[PDB]
């Protein structure tokens, strides 16, 4: 077992922050997998299918800052394509490793399984190009520096990378690196940073009341502490949108709720949109996050910070890392901003479900909500400290949440994971519940059983049959997907029942599946406003 390219890739994987490898085996990656098994730093996590494996890696990377997925050539990598695209859309650094046929087999154009039968072995590599920031076909002549380049770009951009690893390449000799891969910090040209600073100070110095709006790019680049630190030194009205929920302790002074554009609570609208200067840190104003682009923030009202560029008014200042832009704004805010922010009983409904769940969440929770009433209702939760809130509203792929929960629980085995998934969403990735059971995880899974696609019903054709789903027996699923499930399940239809059951499960001693019976047409407040804005 001499040190080879496969070992080099695994060593670089640990350098980037991953302690587990998700995926599904195939004959093209079995020999690479031997090095994963033997590795003392990387844990193989076999998944029920590649799409779930890619979802799990995404959720894993949202907890550890990095993740890796292993698939087999063609059938595996294409199954995971939607997950990688979601990681690209929401800036999640998931490394897609594709085990591939040997280079000699590729060069002869053989009619191998997992190919289109045309002897071409680069179709799927090119198909991955739009959803990755870097990729490489690893050869004997490029492997180690291509691995470093892709991972480095992945770390810089916080977005997926792709490596095609032919089985013969994996075995090629390599030498262990003396230093851990860490390309680290970049600094703006001091004149460029000074110009930004000067422009931001002029704007901030003339601001009567400043507000702060941070979102998911703060999370992805590891600036959550800095933003928390920011609001503590510099009290001001602050909020996130749905994607970046969890950046702030929502019980802190100056926080009035999540910002949603026009769908926002009245206090939130006044706190953020009423400020003459709003600092938008890592924000993307997507249709869902702004309830149909109904946000009212003018360019002259805002200072914007993006990963490599920041904007003051109409002027953009490019080639500035967001970290330096934030440090600049923090210093400036300490000088020029002086605001002192002034502070169950019946049939289950969306309203009393979320109120009941609000009393249940605790610090340290990992909360995942899928698209549908789960995410659009969970936006109203008042998150305590140290909560990792995982939602995917830009990509919006239902089924992500259940499989991502498995990755998150793998990342943080000692943290309580709460899964908020619709009945429709859970059908798409249900087989990863077996992975949770196999690995003895103890998530609290709440299935919002409204018997179909309620969000779709609220958008169009509520009585149409395409909005119906096959009606599953949810409390029986753990017993079918495990020979001895360490789990308990309940079906609740009353608010007192749910609160009583949530009381029972509180310290998550086993996996909990709570089937929540909800009305077919019941809608959380945010989604009602999103539907109200969909008309023309």
């Amino acid at each position: 077992t001499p040190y080879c390219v496969a070992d080099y890739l695994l060593d670089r994987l640990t350098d980037c922050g991953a302690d587990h490898l998700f995926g599904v085996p195939g004959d093209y990656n079995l020999q690479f997998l031997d090095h994963v098994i033997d590795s003392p730093d990387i844990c193989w996590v076999g998944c029920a299918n590649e799409l779930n494996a890619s979802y799990a890696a995404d959720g894993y990377a949202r907890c550890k800052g990095f993740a890796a997925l292993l698939t087999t050539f063609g059938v595996g990598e294409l199954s995971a394509m939607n997950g990688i695209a979601g990681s690209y859309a929401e800036h999640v650094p998931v490394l897609h490793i594709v085990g591939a046929p040997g280079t000699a087999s590729q060069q002869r154009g053989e009619l191998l399984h997992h190919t289109l039968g045309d002897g071409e072995f680069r179709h799927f590599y090119h198909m991955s190009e739009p959803i990755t920031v870097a990729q490489a076909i690893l050869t004997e002549q490029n492997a180690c520096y291509e691995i470093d380049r892709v991972l480095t770009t992945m770390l810089r951009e916080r977005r997926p990378g792709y490596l095609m690893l032919p089985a013969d390449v994996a075995k090629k000799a390599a030498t262990p690196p003396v230093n851990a891969l860490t390309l680290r910090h970049a600094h703006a040209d001091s004149a460029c940073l000074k110009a930004f600073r000067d422009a931001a100070e002029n704007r901030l110095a003339m601001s009567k009341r400043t507000a702060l709006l941070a979102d998911f790019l703060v999370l992805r680049h590891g600036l959550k502490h800095a933003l928390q630190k920011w609001v503590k030194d510099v009290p001001m009205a602050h909020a996130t949108m749905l994607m970046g929920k969890g950046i702030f302790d929502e019980r802190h002074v100056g926080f009035y709720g999540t910002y949603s554009g026009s769908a926002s609570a009245g206090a939130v609208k006044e706190a953020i949109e009423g400020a003459d200067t709003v600092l938008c840190i890592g924000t993307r104003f997507t249709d869902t996050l702004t309830a149909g682009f109904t946000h009212q923030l003018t360019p002259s009202q805002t200072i914007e910070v993006q990963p490599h560029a920041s904007r003051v008014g109409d002027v953009w200042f490019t080639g500035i890392p967001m970290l330096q832009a934030i440090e600049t704004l923090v210093e400036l805010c300490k000088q020029h901003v002086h605001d002192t922010p002034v502070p169950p009983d019946g049939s289950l409904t969306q309203d009393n479900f979320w109120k009941t769940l609000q009393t249940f969440i605790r610090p340290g929770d990992i909360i995942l909500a899928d698209q549908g009433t789960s995410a659009f209702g969970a936006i109203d939760l008042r998150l305590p400290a140290d909560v990792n809130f995982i939602v995917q509203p830009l990509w919006g792929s239902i089924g992500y949440t259940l499989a991502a929960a498995f990755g998150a629980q793998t990342a943080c085995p000692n943290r309580r994971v709460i899964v908020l998934t619709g009945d429709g969403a859970a059908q798409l990735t249900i087989q990863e519940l077996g992975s949770m059971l196999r690995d003895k995880q103890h998530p609290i899974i709440l299935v919002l059983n409204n018997e179909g696609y309620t969000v779709l019903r609220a958008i169009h054709g509520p009585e149409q049959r395409y909005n119906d789903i096959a009606l599953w027996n949810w409390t029986q699923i753990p017993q079918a997907l495990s020979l001895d499930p360490q789990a308990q399940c309940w079906r609740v239809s009353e608010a007192e029942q749910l609160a009583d059951v949530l009381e029972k499960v509180a310290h998550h001693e086993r996996l909990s599946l709570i089937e929540v019976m909800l009305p077919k047409a019941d809608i959380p407040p945010l989604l009602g406003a999103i539907t109200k804005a969909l008309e023309a």
Copy 2:
């Protein structure tokens, strides 16, 4: 509800042979779905996820000659990418309809859900290019003739097509066609056909023993009957490979078993490879079908017929329809082939499982086997007449078989569907069993429970844990995926038990799940030949 582009697409869809549309709804395709619901000719089939929906359409198209899949922009189409690629690889005409945001939203580059957040709406259209034979972005200015062009190319090439249907384009006015969409058989230039006939006539005239080898491309282009009649009218040693199994009634004289390169029964090798002239009709010599490319067929020994070109010896004759080449060769065989033929108890094992199943299959059966010991064992079955044998050994995506069975059973509600899936494979697409139960289908599902990836174990690392799987309670799955599964399930470990159970479920009055307990290391004969031809 005036007639519009959406109705035109559905009208053309029925013309091509699809009576059902598979997929998953999304807000971008709800209004088109109203036309599917309202249509009296096409039935909406909601699926548990898009990947299973694409698998189901593939199996549906293998029974009706055409199929359609409907997904939503981005999250849906990318989830279905592996299914479409498999349809492209094995020449299955599946139409992928992608409901998309309105053109105005696309033109403004809005930050819409199901996008990468870059305002780009053509990434996923271009990613589908390598795995479709034709595509179009439907506009108000091109919709109807782009629809016709894509379907016509699909009909000609027997391969998937792609249509992006912006929600606004679907509502644009159209006129119902007086002529049903059809693609009239091409005709070879009479000199080119004559040149091939004269070269083939010379080749056959000096051949003492001729054998016939047909495979899946015969099935896709609708030449099954032609090959059947050809061997009836001219008896000769004939065979198929694994992909084209089912072309022949395997009980007629001159059929000795499926051809698998070096892995043949002695009679099959002598029947096919021993012939001085072998007619290869629609054959692709992939690694799995040839047991590692160990087939011995020389160019001078073979006459080969492909969809648009045929070969005699070293000379290719292009621009000849496959039908005309066969017709020509049928004429010639009558002229120059003047010849005729040549001359369960105890613990369940792979050997006695397939022996037991051999006595169970009947005419009219639709048999689907997934990659693994299921497909590699089912190759030894001697099929009776009118059997549709669905295997996917070129693409080889496990999980296809279970979801494809749902599509096939939808296609043929009055035929008995036998599903041969491994435990590993069935985990990937298990949620489509709920679709089977919701639609009151009655397949006989045999899950080969060898507790993990046995074929992978036989290839590499039998004791390695990446070849293990989560151990499910298979007979309990219908009770979890339905509120009233009228299903009958058994766990069998004895052959006498299995035969008794197979007698019980023979007339498929209910869905049957037979969990077949097989040894972890038990191997079908073909896979042993595939393993021995590796790293040699």
